[PDB]
Ligand binder design. Structure first.
Ligand SMILES: O=c1onc2n1-c1cc(Br)ccc1OC2
Lengths: 546, 164
């Protein structure tokens, strides 16, 4: 997901502005749906929501727009259990042997013969929660096992939370409402209001452990790789209690990252750290936020947002619709130099041609250079010490950068990676002169629609994840609900689309209408006022009761 | 009863629901949503009820790409009657009303549906929903950043035998 909130000090009109570009599945239980909700006098909010929820999840109201992105905070902890040496179904806490609890569930299974039979399954549970097995990583042997404590299992506040967000007047109100309830499960919240405030909140349900407990309560092997894991044989590694927290064992709101500015805040699924580099967010629990290198999407956005020029709605739109493959900025210049250094190597010919001709985009009419670049980058990712300038904590925006071609071993490995990438691209049955839009599609009935955008891991702000199906890449997730909101005098001006359209049913008039528009990148008015709604030549009305 | 909503649709089938209270507002939402996505919600409710294997057998998967039987075991475990009841008991009056209206609105559409915008008409899994089903979906989403990501792992967790 991406989010940018712009404040009074940077917007072209001196008021708030928000770009909402969440990256979510195109199918299933997390498929966004547009709606506008009004109880005249006390609720008027519009945006999009997930299936089955009678609230707006990402949206706007008269003076406020808000959105969300997936945070890097932990919302659970694994507990490594020390097992009773005499019984692997018992575990030790403070050296005392405790029995695991058993909860059986019974499931009906439809058989080959069309009849039902009953399967019973035992779920083992500790005081922390259920046991989990990842073969070869988190085993359950005679010495140890792993249990999982999920912080959101006790979060009964989630629906009230979004209903409250829906009623929020401005940024300050939104912040009070979220900090009071702490019902948000696993997302950041970014917002802008009419007065020109820009808010970032890393305000979600996060396991709390007092700072002095971490060095001894962490599982050192697992924290390296960023898995939240604690020592489950010591009672002092229970989540810490603090009366200010809305829920027992969670981090109090005052201890979670918040940034309130009048210039800008952004997030692209990295931690709170560089929300705005002028004011780094630091010193939080490792369960909350760490100073890790940022992904190429955030790096791209920061390259567009830094400086002193005013930001226009159009600028934020084009950050999405440009389809720029920002990862290309870091490696393509040097990759092209290596290409020139190997002129007349038959194996590299087609790849170097494609890459030099490439517009560096994931547009419908982008050349096969994108496909070569992708397969190269997958291999480049797994080479050691190949960066000319590796990640530099003191220059987190501009590193890593370039290929260390001056090292002979690197130059050999990079050229080999390019040859390997080219071979793979050429094996697949890509027609001559075929473009990115010829490959990446969304299927609608027996038809296909070309979809612009590319994987977020290549720094395409317009992130689109696709999988191979027959002769094409089928879009499965990414850019979904788009809203771009400004606040001119008459009322909120909202512009956007729902990429995959309102309806998942092929029979619907609204199965592909917005998908056609997304293909052509033609964003539309999101009508909110009675005046806007009434101007719509397609207006239909039905009143229902029972 | 005491359920009423005014729905306007603008271009691209975007609904605008006006009501005097949460019950009516939910009624409008559930109705408009069903019109566009009845089959999707029915499928996801089956998943969140842990009934995929019942309707579709052990081959094949949920829309989250989990095998049907492991997915069912996980959701049966997650959405046990005591967990749903406690969750419900903790809901504010306004939220209870939103959910009550949603279910009634969705079910109204189902009663009237002739297949115009519903491809799964007649399937045994396309059924009237209850507020508990909406709680099943909510809790399924609640754990998406936690134990939800360990669904397969939870199902696989079994004690050691005699091995060396
Ligand atoms: O709006 C609601 O209501 N329940 C949930 N929920 C959520 C929305 C989004 Br977007 C992400 C996570 C959510 O947690 C479950």
């Amino acid at each position: 997901s991406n989010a940018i909130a712009v404040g009074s000090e940077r917007s072209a009109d001196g008021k708030g502005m928000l770009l909402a570009n969440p990256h979510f599945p195109w199918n299933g239980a997390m498929r966004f749906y547009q709606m506008h909700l009004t109880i005249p006098g006390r609720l008027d909010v519009m945006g999009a929501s997930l299936p089955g929820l009678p609230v707006v999840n990402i949206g706007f109201s008269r003076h406020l727009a808000w959105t969300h992105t997936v945070d890097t905070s932990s919302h659970f902890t694994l507990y490594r259990l020390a097992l009773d040496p005499k019984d692997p179904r018992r575990y030790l806490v403070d050296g005392r042997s405790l029995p695991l609890e058993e909860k059986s569930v019974a499931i009906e299974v439809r058989g080959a013969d069309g009849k039902l039979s009953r399967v019973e399954h035992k779920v083992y549970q500790s005081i922390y929660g259920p046991l989990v097995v990842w073969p070869g990583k988190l085993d359950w042997n005679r010495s140890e096992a792993y249990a999982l404590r999920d912080a959101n299992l006790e979060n009964t506040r989630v629906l009230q939370q979004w209903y409250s967000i829906n009623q929020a007047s401005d940024v300050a109100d939104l912040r009070r409402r979220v900090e009071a309830l702490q019902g948000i499960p696993w997302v950041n919240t970014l917002a802008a209001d009419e007065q020109g405030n820009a808010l970032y909140m890393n305000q979600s349900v996060v396991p709390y452990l007092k700072p002095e407990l971490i060095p001894a309560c962490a599982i050192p092997q697992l924290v390296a790789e960023g898995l939240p894991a604690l020592q489950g044989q010591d009672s002092r590694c229970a989540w810490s209690r603090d009366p200010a927290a809305a829920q027992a064992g969670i981090t109090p709101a005052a201890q979670l990252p918040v940034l309130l500015r009048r210039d800008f805040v952004q997030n692209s699924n990295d931690s709170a750290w560089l929300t705005n580099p002028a004011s780094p967010l630091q010193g939080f629990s490792p369960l909350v936020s760490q100073e890790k290198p940022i992904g190429p999407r955030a790096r791209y956005a920061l390259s567009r947002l830094q400086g002193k020029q005013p930001l226009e709605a159009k600028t934020l739109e084009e950050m999405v619709t440009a389809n720029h493959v920002f990862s290309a900025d870091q490696v393509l210049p040097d990759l092209l130099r290596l290409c020139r250094d190997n002129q007349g190597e038959k194996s590299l010919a087609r790849a170097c041609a494609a890459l030099a001709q490439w517009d560096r985009g994931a547009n419908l009419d982008s050349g096969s250079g994108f496909v070569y670049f992708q397969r190269f980058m997958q291999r480049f990712a797994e080479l050691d010490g190949a960066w000319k300038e590796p990640f530099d904590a003191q220059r987190p925006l501009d590193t890593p950068q370039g290929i260390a071609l001056d090292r002979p071993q690197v130059a050999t490995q990079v050229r080999q990676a390019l040859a390997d990438a080219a071979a793979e691209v050429e094996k697949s049955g890509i027609p001559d002169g075929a473009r990115w839009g010829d490959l990446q599609v969304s299927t609608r009935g027996q038809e296909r629609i070309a979809i612009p955008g590319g994987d977020g891991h290549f720094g395409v702000y317009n992130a689109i994840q696709s999988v191979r199906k027959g002769d094409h890449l089928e879009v499965v997730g990414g850019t979904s609900y788009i809203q771009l909101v400004t606040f001119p005098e008459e009322g909120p001006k909202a512009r956007g689309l729902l990429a995959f359209s309102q309806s998942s049913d092929p029979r619907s008039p609204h199965y592909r209408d917005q998908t056609e528009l997304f293909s052509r990148q033609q964003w539309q008015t999101l009508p909110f006022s009675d005046r806007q709604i009434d101007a719509d030549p397609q207006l239909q009305r039905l009143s229902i009761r029972e | 009863t005491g359920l009423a909503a005014d729905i306007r649709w603008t271009a691209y089938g975007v609904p605008h629901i006006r009501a005097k209270d949460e019950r009516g507002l939910g009624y409008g939402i559930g109705y408009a949503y069903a019109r566009d996505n009845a089959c999707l919600l029915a499928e996801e409710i089956v998943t969140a009820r842990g009934e995929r294997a019942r309707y579709f057998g052990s081959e094949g998967k949920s829309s989250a790409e989990l095998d049907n039987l492991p997915s069912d075991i996980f959701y049966a475990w997650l959405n046990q009657p005591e967990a749903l009841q406690a969750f419900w008991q903790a809901q504010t009056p306004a939220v209870r009303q939103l959910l009550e209206g949603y279910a009634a609105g969705f079910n109204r559409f189902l009663r009237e549906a002739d297949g115009k915008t519903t491809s799964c008409l007649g399937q045994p899994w396309l059924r009237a929903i209850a507020t508990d089903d909406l709680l099943r979906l909510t809790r399924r989403l609640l754990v998406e950043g936690g134990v939800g990501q360990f669904a397969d792992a939870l199902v696989a967790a079994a004690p050691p035998g005699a091995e060396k």
